[PDB]
Amino acid sequence: YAMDYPWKASLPRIETRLYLDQYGGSGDVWIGKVLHRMTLFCNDLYLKAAKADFSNFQKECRVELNGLRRWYLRSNLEKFGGTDPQTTLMTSYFLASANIFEANRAAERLGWARVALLADAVSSHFRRIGGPKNSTSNLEELISLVPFDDAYSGS
Amino acid sequence: YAMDYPWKASLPRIETRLYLDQYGGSGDVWIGKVLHRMTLFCNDLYLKAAKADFSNFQKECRVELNGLRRWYLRSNLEKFGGTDPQTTLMTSYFLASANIFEANRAAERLGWARVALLADAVSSHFRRIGGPKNSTSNLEELISLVPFDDAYSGS
């Protein structure tokens, strides 16, 4: 994994799932003059911390895409663009949630993935008419499909 | 003044101006059993006190007038409006400045003026077209004339 995925392109979440699938724990032994183990270093407990918090993170985020689904399919924006909405829906939430993965900054997390899906289905719409020379529908009103909050939606 | 200006028609700045003409200071003399004075509140420096409080009130009454009159021109609004827009600006800003007379509430004083132009001048526009039936544009766009404060704008 390290030779073909450099630091420059690795998401900070993909291998953290894969690191569970590669880690033995305290069933792994160092040799020396005499073989030995290290329990401040390797336990069956660091996994128990990790298979607790990452597992409920995997739990608590897949109900969010379940909640993020219908908004895309109700705000009249899913109609045009790609061949199908669902593969663009799951792609745009992956890179928007593999980076930020803690339960206190969801408002930044899901608000990222919304305006992720806003700017590309309209990027599709401009080439399908050939640029902004022959577009007539007003485009600064699509920005209101994100709900109005005071602390965010001003600027 | 007190026989034709009820409490429902008495404004807190046109009142103060109309008492300085009948204010005496220490020149007002009281009659008891003996012709006698009372130096404390019947006092001549009090007349100079409020008049020192009243000039510096009016000094911002000219510069917010000059400040607003350059904004109303460039905003392309004199297309609409009454045939005398300067006095229409006068009758709108005064109706705020006679109400709020404290200094550091200028943002309340400017906003009450700047909304009540573009909220009134549109009502002239509908008297020609018949209502909202025969409209030809999006009337929602007319807060572009309003300055952007990053806290105050969106709500």
Curated annotation (Swiss-Prot), chains A, B:
The record comments on the domains as follows:
The Asp-Xaa-Asp-Asp (DXDD) motif is important for the catalytic activity, presumably through binding to Mg(2+).
Compartments, record wording: Plastid, Chloroplast
What is the protein's species of origin? Oryza sativa subsp. japonica (Rice)
Q: Which family does it belong to?
A: Belongs to the terpene synthase family.
State the phenotype upon gene disruption. Answer: No visible phenotype under normal growth conditions. Mutant plants exhibit increased susceptibility to the rice blast fungus Magnaporthe grisea, and reduced capacity to inhibit germination and growth of lowland weeds in paddy soil, possibly due to decreased levels of momilactones and oryzalexin S.
Q: At the top level of its lineage, which domain of life is listed?
A: Eukaryota
Another remark in the UniProt entry says:
Phytoalexins are diterpenoid secondary metabolites involved in the defense mechanism of the plant and produced in response to attack (by a pathogen, elicitor or UV irradiation).
Q: What is this protein called?
A: Syn-copalyl diphosphate synthase, chloroplastic
Q: Give a short account of what the protein does.
A: Catalyzes the conversion of geranylgeranyl diphosphate to the phytoalexin precursor syn-copalyl diphosphate. Required for the biosynthesis of momilactones that exude from roots and act as allelochemicals against lowland weeds in paddy soil.
The recorded induction information for this protein reads:
Induced by UV irradiation. Induced by methyl jasmonate.
- Interval of the full protein contained in this chain: 466 to 620 of 767
